[PDB]
Amino acid sequence: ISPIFQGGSYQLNNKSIDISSLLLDKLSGESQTVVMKFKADKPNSLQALFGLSNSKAGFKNNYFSIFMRDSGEIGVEIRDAQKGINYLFSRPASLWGKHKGQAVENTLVFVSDSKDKTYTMYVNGIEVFSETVDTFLPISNINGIDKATLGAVNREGKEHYLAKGSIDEISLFNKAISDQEVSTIPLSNPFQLIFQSGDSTQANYFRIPTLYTLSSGRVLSSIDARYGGTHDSKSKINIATSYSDDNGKTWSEPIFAMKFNDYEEQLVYWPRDNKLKNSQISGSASFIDSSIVEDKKSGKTILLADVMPAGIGNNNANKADSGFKEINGHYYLKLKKNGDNDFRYTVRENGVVYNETTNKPTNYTINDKYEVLEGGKSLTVEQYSVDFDSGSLRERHNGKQVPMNVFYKDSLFKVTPTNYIAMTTSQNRGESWEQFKLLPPFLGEKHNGTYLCPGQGLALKSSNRLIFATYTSGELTYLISDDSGQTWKKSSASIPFKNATAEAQMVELRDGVIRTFFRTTTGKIAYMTSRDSGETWSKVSYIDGIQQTSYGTQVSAIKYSQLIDGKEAVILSTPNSRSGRKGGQLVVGLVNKEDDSIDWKYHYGIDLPSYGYAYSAITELPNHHIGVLFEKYDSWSRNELHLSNVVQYIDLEINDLT
Numbered sequence: 130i131s132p133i134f135q136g137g138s139y140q141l142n143n144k145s146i147d148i149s150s151l152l153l154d155k156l157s158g159e160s161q162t163v164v165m166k167f168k169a170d171k172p173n174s175l176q177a178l179f180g181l182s183n184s185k186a187g188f189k190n191n192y193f194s195i196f197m198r199d200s201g202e203i204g205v206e207i208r209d210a211q212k213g214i215n216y217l218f219s220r221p222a223s224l225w226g227k228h229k230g231q232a233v234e235n236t237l238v239f240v241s242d243s244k245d246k247t248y249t250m251y252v253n254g255i256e257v258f259s260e261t262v263d264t265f266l267p268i269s270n271i272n273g274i275d276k277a278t279l280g281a282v283n284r285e286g287k288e289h290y291l292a293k294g295s296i297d298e299i300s301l302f303n304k305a306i307s308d309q310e311v312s313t314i315p316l317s318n319p320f321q322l323i324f325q326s327g328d329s330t331q332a333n334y335f336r337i338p339t340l341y342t343l344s345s346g347r348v349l350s351s352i353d354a355r356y357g358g359t360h361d362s363k364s365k366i367n368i369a370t371s372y373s374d375d376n377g378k379t380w381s382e383p384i385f386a387m388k389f390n391d392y393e394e395q396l397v398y399w400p401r402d403n404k405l406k407n408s409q410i411s412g413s414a415s416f417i418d419s420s421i422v423e424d425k426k427s428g429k430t431i432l433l434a435d436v437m438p439a440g441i442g443n444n445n446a447n448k449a450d451s452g453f454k455e456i457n458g459h460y461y462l463k464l465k466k467n468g469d470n471d472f473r474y475t476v477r478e479n480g481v482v483y484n485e486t487t488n489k490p491t492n493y494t495i496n497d498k499y500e501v502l503e504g505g506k507s508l509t510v511e512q513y514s515v516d517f518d519s520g521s522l523r524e525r526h527n528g529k530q531v532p533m534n535v536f537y538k539d540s541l542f543k544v545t546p547t548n549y550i551a552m553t554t555s556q557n558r559g560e561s562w563e564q565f566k567l568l569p570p571f572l573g574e575k576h577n578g579t580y581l582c583p584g585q586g587l588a589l590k591s592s593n594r595l596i597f598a599t600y601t602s603g604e605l606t607y608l609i610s611d612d613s614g615q616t617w618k619k620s621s622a623s624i625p626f627k628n629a630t631a632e633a634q635m636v637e638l639r640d641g642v643i644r645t646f647f648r649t650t651t652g653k654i655a656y657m658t659s660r661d662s663g664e665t666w667s668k669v670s671y672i673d674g675i676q677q678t679s680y681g682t683q684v685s686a687i688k689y690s691q692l693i694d695g696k697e698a699v700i701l702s703t704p705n706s707r708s709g710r711k712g713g714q715l716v717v718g719l720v721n722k723e724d725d726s727i728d729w730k731y732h733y734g735i736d737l738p739s740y741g742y743a744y745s746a747i748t749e750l751p752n753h754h755i756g757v758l759f760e761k762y763d764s765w766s767r768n769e770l771h772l773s774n775v776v777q778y779i780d781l782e783i784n785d786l787t
């Protein structure tokens with residue numbers, strides 16, 4: 130259909146533009162679509178881009194508006210006092226502000242559908258809300274509407290929500306256009322999606338991105354595919370991967386690197402209201418926080434992640450049990466059988482389930498997928514699905530049988546309810562992943578697993594050594610393998626904070642010299658240095674010049690392959706803010722060869738200081754551009770839970786950063 134109105138290049142400079150004469154007599158019927166291309170790189174705290182209002186005294190609550198906040202939130206109001214209707218729909222973190230120094234042209238599509246009684250908002254090709262109501266209010270059937278406005282809402286003759294920005298294009302249609310038609314509207318996005326709602330993972334949410342550039346030039350990414358909203362474990366979460374063979378321009382359909390089947394892979398719209406938003410999947414096993422490295426020796430790609438048994442997360446994991454029994458300098462996974470009060474079993478060589486009370490083997494074995502076999506035959510359990518049909522979260526059996534896994538709630542044999550680390554490998558650079566194996570405990574029988582630092586592991590230039598940073602109370606625990614991940618040893622490095630989420634990432638400054646940058650509880654990013662390929666570690670220092678919150682955020686870090694200003698360069702990615710996870714920056718540091726000190730010389734702002742930026746992944750692409758995959762929202766904020774399609778990917782050149 131044709132638009133009933135189309136206009137453009139409106140500058141909103143804290144003074145509204147009246148388009149009543151052009152628009153109001155064109156509005157007809159009860160369904161409308163608004164399409165708007167706009168920029169706002171310096172928005173006011175709360176501002177309206179478009180308004181339709183009754184501007185008369187006594188009718189201040191009769192208006193429709195499309196509004197935004199300087200947090201990046203988008204929303205609408207639809208109000209009529211005579212009808213007794215006051216709708217407010219919005220979603221945080223829906224907008225872009227600036228990219229590479231330039232204001233971003235956001236593409237907004239709002240559909241008001243009287244027949245389905247549904248209001249739907251898309252921004253930049255992403256559906257940010259879709260709300261169905263019992264009593265529908267058509268946006269141009271509000272009582273006594275007499276003003277159509279850009280850059281404010283006229284209430285009782287005064288300009289409310291004055292906007293700073295520009296509306297380069299605005300069209301309106303007397304029709305609710307289909308999702309199909311919506312997808313044909315050209316976009317001007319500065320980003321792309323790798324993982325997204327509706328893809329092969331069927332997770333509606335994603336967090337904890339990684340990126341790693343392989344020797345073939347293929348670029349690999351991993352992520353938490355989070356099913357039960359954006360919550361950390363306990364939940365249902367799988368690890369998914371995708372790769373690009375063309376310097377990040379296009380990405381493969383995701384596959385799983387690590388997955389559990391005890392719960393169905395459901396795409397669910399997790400509730401965001403204050404009563405239900407903390408609803409949390411409570412009986413599923415999960416994986417969380419992945420990290421990738423490539424091994425020179427075998428050519429294999431290696432991926433580690435934390436593993437949580439059914440209903441377990443960092444909050445309730447048994448801190449005083451590794452889940453393994455030491456028997457002769459060897460560690461065996463402990464198991465509890467249905468009905469026993471203690472763990473009277475172990476998994477020994479070739480997966481034989483052994484009875485500890487009698488040191489007899491049983492007729493049970495554990496296969497390579499940690500599935501239970503009796504006499505060589507597969508045992509099964511019934512799968513669960515989740516729903517909010519009753520008005521609160523329910524988890525119930527769905528009729529489907531899946532292989533019985535020792536990490537499952539319904540298993541005959543169950544592992545210790547604590548956290549573990551697993552590894553899987555790929556022989557084809559991420560086209561398929563092997564079945565995962567658990568790493569051994571590194572801090573003794575009576576200490577829970579360390580926590581893997583998400584991002585990249587480190588492959589040293591001059592050897593086959595592989596290192597993965599992990600953290601626990603009071604230290605960083607580096608996991609080191611010299612044999613393609615077949616065996617591991619730890620190298621502990623004390624840090625002066627207890628209870629820190631000390632997520633750490635490493636760069637090799639020069640041969641055998643490793644600097645680790647890590648999250649702390651001090652509001653500053655810290656670092657330590659090894660000069661013997663991770664064997665021993667220095668005291669902890671801090672970076673001034675970058676601020677984090679008291680709780681901190683993951684920091685990603687790479688060593689750039691090319692000189693910058695004639696010097697070796699390190700690039701950090703992190704929010705730069707004392708207040709929240711926002712103000713994303715890449716920070717370029719030049720190395721002083723005299724003492725390996727780093728002078729942080731350039732700060733590139735990824736978007737506005739007030740727009741969200743949390744966990745991130747960076748990697749040097751084979752063409753020497755920088756790829757960044759990041760959480761574009763505040764993943765700490767309890768107001769920004771359960772948002773879809775906020776983990777986004779951008780491509781930057783060094784000239785953009787300097």
Ligand SMILES: CC(=O)N[C@@H]1[C@@H](O)[C@@H](F)[C@](F)(C(=O)O)O[C@H]1[C@H](O)[C@H](O)CO
Pocket residue numbers: 337361362417418435442443444580630764765
């Ligand atoms: C293993 C685990 O639970 N890792 C998660 C991350 O995946 C991330 F999600 C994050 F929460 C965060 O700071 O955002 O950190 C932790 C965690 O939930 C808590 O912060 C601390 O218990």
Ligand SMILES: O=S(=O)(O)[C@]1(CNC2CCCCC2)C[C@@H](O)[C@@H](O)C1
Pocket residue numbers: 340341342343585587588687688690748749750751752753
């Ligand atoms: O130097 S590596 O540790 O092998 C690595 C890749 N380097 C290439 C060198 C050539 C340009 C692309 C990046 C850096 C880490 O961030 C991982 O991406 C792997």
